[PDB]
Amino acid sequence: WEDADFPILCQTCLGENPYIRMTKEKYGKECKICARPFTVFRWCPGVRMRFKKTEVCQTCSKLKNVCQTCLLDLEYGLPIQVRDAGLSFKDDMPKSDVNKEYYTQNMEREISNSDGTRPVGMLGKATSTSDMLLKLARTTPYYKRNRPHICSFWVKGECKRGEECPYRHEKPTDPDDPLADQNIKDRYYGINDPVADKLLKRASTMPRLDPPEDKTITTLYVGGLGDTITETDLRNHFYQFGEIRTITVVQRQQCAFIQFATRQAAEVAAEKSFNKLIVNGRRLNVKWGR
Amino acid sequence: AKTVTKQRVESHFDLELRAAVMHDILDMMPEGIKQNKARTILQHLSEAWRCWKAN
Amino acid sequence: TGVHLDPAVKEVQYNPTYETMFAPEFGPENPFRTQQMAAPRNMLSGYAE
Amino acid sequence: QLSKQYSSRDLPSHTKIKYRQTTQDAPEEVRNRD
Amino acid sequence: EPPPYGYRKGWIPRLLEDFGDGGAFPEIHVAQYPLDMGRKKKMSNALAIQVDSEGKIKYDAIARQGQSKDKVIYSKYTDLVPKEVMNADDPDLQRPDEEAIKEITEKTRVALEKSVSQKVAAAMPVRAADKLAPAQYIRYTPSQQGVAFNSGAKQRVIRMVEMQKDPMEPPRFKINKKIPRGPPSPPAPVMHSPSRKMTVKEQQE
Amino acid sequence: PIMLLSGHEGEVYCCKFHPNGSTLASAGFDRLILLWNVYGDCDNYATLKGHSGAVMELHYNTDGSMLFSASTDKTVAVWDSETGERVKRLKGHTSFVNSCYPARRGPQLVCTGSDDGTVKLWDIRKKAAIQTFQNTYQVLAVTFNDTSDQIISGGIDNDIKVWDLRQNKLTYTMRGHADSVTGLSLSSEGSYLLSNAMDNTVRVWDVRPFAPKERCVKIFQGNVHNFEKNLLRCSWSPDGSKIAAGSADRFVYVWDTTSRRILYKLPGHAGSINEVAFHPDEPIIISASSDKRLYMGEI
Amino acid sequence: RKRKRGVDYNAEIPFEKKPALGFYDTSEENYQAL
Amino acid sequence: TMPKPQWHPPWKLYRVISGHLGWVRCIAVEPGNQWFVTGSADRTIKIWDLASGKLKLSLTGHISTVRGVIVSTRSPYLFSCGEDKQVKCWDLEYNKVIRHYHGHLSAVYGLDLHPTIDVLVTCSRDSTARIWDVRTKASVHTLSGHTNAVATVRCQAAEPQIITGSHDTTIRLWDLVAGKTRVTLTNHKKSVRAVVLHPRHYTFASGSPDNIKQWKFPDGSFIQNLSGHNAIINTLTVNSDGVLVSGADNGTMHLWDWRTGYNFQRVHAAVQPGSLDSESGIFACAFDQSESRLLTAEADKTIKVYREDDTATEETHPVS
Amino acid sequence: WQPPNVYLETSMGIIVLELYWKHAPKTCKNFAELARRGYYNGTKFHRIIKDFMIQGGDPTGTGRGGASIYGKQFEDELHPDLKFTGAGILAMANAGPDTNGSQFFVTLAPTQWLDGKHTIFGRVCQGIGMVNRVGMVETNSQDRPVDDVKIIKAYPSG
């Protein structure tokens, strides 16, 4: 079994009050990943909010670098399928019983040679956190997580304990929703997480800069400039990102147009700049001009 | 890791006699480079024993 | 420059003066670091003492 | 992964080491002897 | 070649040739790429080809591959070569003096005995349990920093308490799981003398 | 070296040296007082017993022969360092006695601050109270004047006060502390007084036949308070040169009088440092911390 | 189904060791099919 | 070449003890030099007086070949080790077994004692070594990593503390407290069955049918070869005076100089009357504590005792 | 006194940097007189940002050492048109302006950000394939690479 200093989970799962209270039990239960005994630390999430507990081996955690309670990545905080693909990451973790046990054993052996600072392996050589991941990343603590279940009594009427229904006495979700039944093991294996496919559809429909037809359209219109900008500042936005050939800063329409010297350089600057090239705070729009 | 009791005394003597042989020469005084026919020097050893016993 | 202490070594036996302890390092910050990859952590996700 | 099984033979027994005394042959006299 | 200093105005060198023997023109408003320079390239798996501090090809890396600086890995001929010693009075031929020896005795004895007594208490199994030690107070510095989480504080100080083990509780988990043995170590190098093939005569002998 | 000391059941609140610097006194919650050899291997020999509440202040004489100790259990107590056994139980103190101060080289007497609302004078010989100045509130810190004719006190009104032993009314009140007064210390000049306060600002004054009547001279930044509100204590150097402080950050604060720079903000600690003792002869420091141990730094 | 090591073969490389890499360009290398 | 080696006198056979009923496989000397102890493949442990060679006593506990015995410097204990997978602790004040260390999985090929602490090292055919706590019979460490029978093991107080030579033809120096292999020496071509440590020189030798090798502590660096003895080498044993005895398995035993590596004597004894000539072979050698006598334990059931020759000089025995 | 191309034949291979005194005379004199002083022997690369920057040149090798020809540090010699727009930008970096010391940085790619915070002083007119090789190598979490790389010979152009 394992031995820990404290858990690994996001802020959402981690809590709000400055003084957190969690009780420890050594060899408390079985990591559904490492399959073996782990330590269990149990944290009081919030006022009348469900007490959580550590739910994966610390090595089972340092493997993929995710939350040992919240289950989402610790840098971004999106489904592991997503975060992996956002690094273009492709892990070979084995699945069958004997294969998985052998894998876990040698994995713990190889992780024993670590210093306890960062996940092992490609988890660093994929650390180019793409603005796709940055943008799909949630901003504030979605602290609805520590609300209880649907008090099945209180769903049929029965929850006769007064207000102490152990569970949120609301309308139960229609399990026809794909966001309902995601087997914890599959969510950990990155195996067909419908919430992850939802994040894929969202990060596919989310706005990105468009490509034009002919290669000789190397003029790029940046809409929404304002009169705090300089031509050298538009340059320093798009200058070492390649070479620029010219720039027209339209002050009668508050825009710009970078004629480039490298098409792929133009693509780099503009596509990375789509609505987010924020120098001195003005939302410019990177497109390929007429 | 079970002890050697009274019924495994002969069986164990032979495990260890023929292990010792295989250590002893058929892998530390070879120079039969190929594949040292240890499986056949052990067959001699068992027939040498039968012939001793039968005189 | 005189005696400064290696900021990554936390077992340091010589009694450092103010600057001899907390002299700041020359250069820029690593942009390749997620905030987690910039922060000082004894554990994987954040230091505990 | 330390089991709770057990043995009659691993019960505590002979828990003090007899150290070789002064008269028997201590490593001191061996330090001396010719 | 590269136009002179003060006379390098006007041209932008795009093929690495206009670098001559090399060089970037900082005042020339382009990304300069003299001799493969500038380009972040494909992330390929060749590990760092190091060179010794005399300019050689240190295959000691390929030997010590994925191993710490503790491992002694003899793969140089200068290890094969017979040293000569003729002084029964050299430093080389002298053991550590008994002060270091008594130090290492005390350290060995200590760590030994602690691990002993844990494995011995394993053969207690009826632990006449000692009670739960004093409470843990730990200061946690999250790497996640931000005004919104922890409602705006840069540290959390946490109370760990040890939860009771129920005495009448059987073992909890199936310990006896069998798998093959893990892959060994980085193989050592075979530092052998030159081996001779035998005559076919000898072979038949 | 590092020379971290341990052996205490709880936090160490009060620590000082022999006025020789021969044997060492430390104590805290544990309701007894640990003593050590400062030198050698920092050896731990004797422990005074008895004091029911946390021993809120240890105080030597200035030669090093008798031991006064104000404990929260309504009492001050005198003890013989020769023995470790109590010479007097200065009782009568109606509530938590925080502070004690025995007069140095004057006749035998102590001025005591407590959690009652009084400053009390007592004699070692009579088991009797000499005076009592009720300002209105509990008295947290008391240090004499070097003539032993004024009593300096720091309480809850941020207004540092001094009584005339003979005229018995509020002789000197000086103000400028941003919050409550937590530590007073008379330098070896006999003249300058040093005061810490949780308000992050610590002050120096000079109690003379003449001081400018607004005598806030030197001010030091760095001391911390937190939701703990533990006791804060400071000292001068034996040479009146280095300002020694502890605080609730786990940083021991070493400044100078002269350039008032940070000479050291030393880490190493796990607990909030509750008292710093300077050695009367050596560049030796003992940091009594709430991590239930001590440090002995050489500088 | 109850086959505890049967599918270790058609599914995954049963007990896998990745070929250790040395001093050369291995990533863009890849192979054609059957 | 090298300096010129010291001239050592020769050794001459002077006693031949006969009482065993099978190969004699291990031999050891008391601390105080009154008696030596032999353990044989007739399963007995005999205890002989070293002055006269009379047998004082014979202990019978084992179930098979005793393959190694040793006697504790610090406690009145003899430790025996056998092919029945068992390691026994004889207490010499009742002459009785009091302690037994269970846990190996095949014959235990050899055994050694730590001189400062009370721990035991044993090497066996399951290709591991083990460190037992003498007093609570518990395995504190299982030195694994060889890939064949671990023919021999020696322990010392300096560092590294444990040296095991095996039948996969490699040597390993182990860190005890860590309990894992520091250095791996793969210089020998055939199985390594004997290794020895110099009493005062932070050096150690390791023998195999190829040639003896000398090496330097603590990182195991080559020093020199020693060649000439081309036979399976069962024992190496080094004097205080730089005498190095290498006893082989086809009977022959050569004597060398530890320092220069010069083989100055070659002894070929004759087998006890009724033996075949293929029943000549030496399994154990031991210098007495005066380092004056040299005992050997033979494959023809004899103990041959050699003494130092007092009437020879550099001009009787020229050095080459 | 402006050593045109200053040679730092490093352990893995040579480097040579041409500093434009017209663009950066002061740190040009610093680097010329410094390489001629040879106090650089033993500088381990104090930072490796793969494909972005290579930085070294500290007698400390931790990041808190380094002193100049003028005391501890001098001001920047800042340029209008010189940028870090590409690899081989040789500019001594600052943790705060007017504090440029002994540590030297050598770019690996367009670094137009530290422009205006670093006076770009010249370029490595030799050793740029080697610079790519160096910027490839594996570094620990603290940019002092797992390879202890130092310069063999530090000297000016004649």
Swiss-Prot record, chain B:
Note the superkingdom of the native organism: Eukaryota
Tissue specificity note? Widely expressed.
Intracellular or extracellular location(s): Nucleus; Nucleus speckle
Q: How does it assemble?
A: Part of the U5 snRNP complex. Component of the U4/U6-U5 tri-snRNP complex composed of the U4, U6 and U5 snRNAs and at least PRPF3, PRPF4, PRPF6, PRPF8, PRPF31, SNRNP200, TXNL4A, SNRNP40, DDX23, CD2BP2, PPIH, SNU13, EFTUD2, SART1 and USP39. Component of the U5.U4atac/U6atac snRNP complexes in U12-dependent spliceosomes. Within the minor spliceosome, which acts on U12-type introns, interacts with PPIL2 and RBM48. Core component of U2-type precatalytic, catalytic and postcatalytic spliceosomal complexes. Found in a mRNA splicing-dependent exon junction complex (EJC) with SRRM1.
So what does this one do?
Plays a role in pre-mRNA splicing as core component of precatalytic, catalytic and postcatalytic spliceosomal complexes, both of the predominant U2-type spliceosome and the minor U12-type spliceosome. Functions as a scaffold that mediates the ordered assembly of spliceosomal proteins and snRNAs. Required for the assembly of the U4/U6-U5 tri-snRNP complex, a building block of the spliceosome. Functions as a scaffold that positions spliceosomal U2, U5 and U6 snRNAs at splice sites on pre-mRNA substrates, so that splicing can occur. Interacts with both the 5' and the 3' splice site.
Curated annotation (Swiss-Prot), chain C:
Where does it live in the cell? Nucleus; Nucleus speckle
Mutagenesis / variant outcome for changing P28A: Loss of isomerization. Can rescue splicing defects when transfected in knockout cells
Describe the processing and modification events after translation: Undergoes isomerization of the peptide bond between Gly-27 and Pro-28. The reaction is catalyzed by PPIL1.
The record's subunit annotation is: Component of the pre-catalytic and catalytic spliceosome complexes. Component of the postcatalytic spliceosome P complex. Interacts with PPIL1; this interaction leads to CDC40 isomerization.
Disease per record: Pontocerebellar hypoplasia 15: A form of pontocerebellar hypoplasia, a disorder characterized by structural defects of the pons and cerebellum, evident upon brain imaging. PCH15 is a severe autosomal recessive form characterized by progressive microcephaly, and poor or absent psychomotor development with severely impaired intellectual development apparent from birth. Other features may include spastic quadriplegia, early-onset seizures, and chronic anemia and thrombocytopenia.
The protein's role, per its UniProt record: Required for pre-mRNA splicing as component of the activated spliceosome. Plays an important role in embryonic brain development; this function does not require proline isomerization.
Query: What protein name is recorded for this chain?
Result: Pre-mRNA-processing factor 17
Gene that specifies this protein: CDC40
Curated annotation (Swiss-Prot), chain D:
Organism of this sequence: Homo sapiens
Protein function: Involved in pre-mRNA splicing as component of the spliceosome. Component of the PRP19-CDC5L complex that forms an integral part of the spliceosome and is required for activating pre-mRNA splicing. As a component of the minor spliceosome, involved in the splicing of U12-type introns in pre-mRNAs.
Q: Note the subunit structure.
A: Identified in the spliceosome C complex. Component of the PRP19-CDC5L splicing complex composed of a core complex comprising a homotetramer of PRPF19, CDC5L, PLRG1 and BCAS2, and at least three less stably associated proteins CTNNBL1, CWC15 and HSPA8. Interacts directly with CTNNBL1 in the complex. Component of the minor spliceosome, which splices U12-type introns.
Write down what this protein is called: Spliceosome-associated protein CWC15 homolog
What family does this belong to? Belongs to the CWC15 family.
UniProt lists compositionally biased (Polar residues) regions at 1-10
Phosphothreonine is carried by which residues?
T23
**Compartment(s) of residence:** Nucleus
Look up the domain of life of the source.
Answer: Eukaryota
UniProtKB/Swiss-Prot annotation, chain E:
Give the residue ranges for region: Interaction with PPIL1. Answer: 20-40
Positions of region (Disordered): 170-194
> Where is the cross-link described as Glycyl lysine isopeptide (Lys-Gly) (interchain with G-Cter in SUMO2)?
K42, K58, K76, K83, K102, K119, K131, K154, K201
Give the modified residues of type Phosphoserine.
S143, S151, S185, S193, S195
What subcellular locations does the record give? Nucleus
Q: Which domain of life is it from?
A: Eukaryota
Q: Which residues form a coiled coil?
A: none
What function does the entry list?
A: Involved in pre-mRNA splicing as component of the spliceosome. As a component of the minor spliceosome, involved in the splicing of U12-type introns in pre-mRNAs. Required for the specific splicing of CDKN1A pre-mRNA; the function probably involves the recruitment of U2AF2 to the mRNA. May recruit PPIL1 to the spliceosome. May be involved in cyclin-D1/CCND1 mRNA stability through the SNARP complex which associates with both the 3'end of the CCND1 gene and its mRNA. Involved in transcriptional regulation. (Microbial infection) Is recruited by HIV-1 Tat to Tat:P-TEFb:TAR RNA complexes and is involved in Tat transcription by recruitment of MYC, MEN1 and TRRAP to the HIV promoter.
Q: Which family does it belong to?
A: Belongs to the SNW family.
Q: What is this protein called?
A: SNW domain-containing protein 1
Q: Which organism is it from?
A: Homo sapiens (Human)
Query: What does the organism's lineage look like at the top?
Result: Eukaryota, Metazoa, Chordata, Craniata, Vertebrata
**Per UniProt, what is the name of the gene that codes for the protein in this document?**
SNW1
User: Which portion of the entire protein is included?
Assistant: 40 to 244 of 536
